[PDB]
Symmetry: D2
Subunit: 109 residues, 4 copies
């Protein structure tokens, strides 16, 4: 798999577990088409979203449902989600706080 998503919780110092992640690809008609989705594991990682064959050149959006994550912990956060948009191994990492997030791409191989 050429795409992995890793989510960390900066309040608890832990992986962010069971976070929903949705991936979209921009279609020829300029709309966002749903591409893949999943939930982070106990390690905060989401593997297997796609394959080398399916992950063609294009514009991709990774939407991380941070709001549901914080609300399940009792926290009303600022952001609706964390959005990562890029043109195409990619690791998309997100570090979450209730009123802040950071995202980093690590691109290897």
């Amino acid at each position: 798999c050429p795409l992995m998503v890793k989510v960390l919780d900066a309040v608890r110092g832990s992986p962010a577990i069971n976070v929903a992640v949705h991936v979209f690809r921009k279609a020829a008609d300029d709309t966002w088409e749903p591409f893949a989705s999943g939930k982070t594991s106990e390690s905060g990682e989401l593997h297997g979203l796609t394959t080398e064959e399916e992950f063609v050149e294009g514009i991709y959006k990774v939407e991380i449902d941070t709001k549901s994550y914080w609300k399940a912990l009792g926290i009303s956060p600022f952001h609706e989600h964390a959005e990562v948009v890029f043109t195409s191994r990619y690791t998309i990492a997100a570090l979450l706080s209730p009123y802040s997030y950071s995202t980093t791409a690590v691109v290897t191989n």
Copy 2:
């Protein structure tokens, strides 16, 4: 002025100047409607985007054109832009500062919400 945007450059240690910023509001048909826009100043700040009267409760998106900024500096970037999506909340008086710190392969955004 209930909404300000501030952008910093983590490579040069400087305000990120002349960065395009677009604000959208989610419409009833679930599309994003352009709302306001501008360019960051020499202090990296964008003031005057909206008014207390216009900035009603709703879902907003602030799109920061980071890719064009890094292209102007000759540094290859990862992201097309930085997007900040939030629901505003008129429970008490509020001012929103959306702060973004930019690196070519990383950004962070923070909301500073004050009375």
Copy 3:
């Protein structure tokens, strides 16, 4: 005033108020000598730490007491403090803003250096 410190709270989305900040300068015997200190204001900013005349080229450490801040909010933190160590450089006129964004298990610090 060539050196300012600004601290934000990523959990509450607010300036980090009443945070103790200590500045040190490296002495000839390689020890850290206290130089200046204060507490952040209601805007999360600490002004007036030093003067252009006092702030000569050297190695400085800015220590932000993040642990006491999180203890006051009742949130268990990881770090004892946030430390920012840098060499100042009087090649042209400069102002230094040391900005820190605090979470209980994470912080980021950025230098904004302007003419």
Copy 4:
């Protein structure tokens, strides 16, 4: 090993390779005693710094030599190093830019 250090480069979107890391422990006389050191690998990770037996309760400082890293890439950075100070699995992660860094602790098991 109860302590791992991971360093990422936010300019290139890559692990930060061959970064020097020094660990100190505060002694009873209130001085910093050198505890362990190493260099990050091709994955940006530094494993094996210590053992469960050696990593007793105490105050630790992890000093990451970011200045040498940037200077080897032609960049004159702001910070002399990134310092992480904490009282005691710990993963200390640092994300580096020339005028900014972030550090996050991920504490598991």
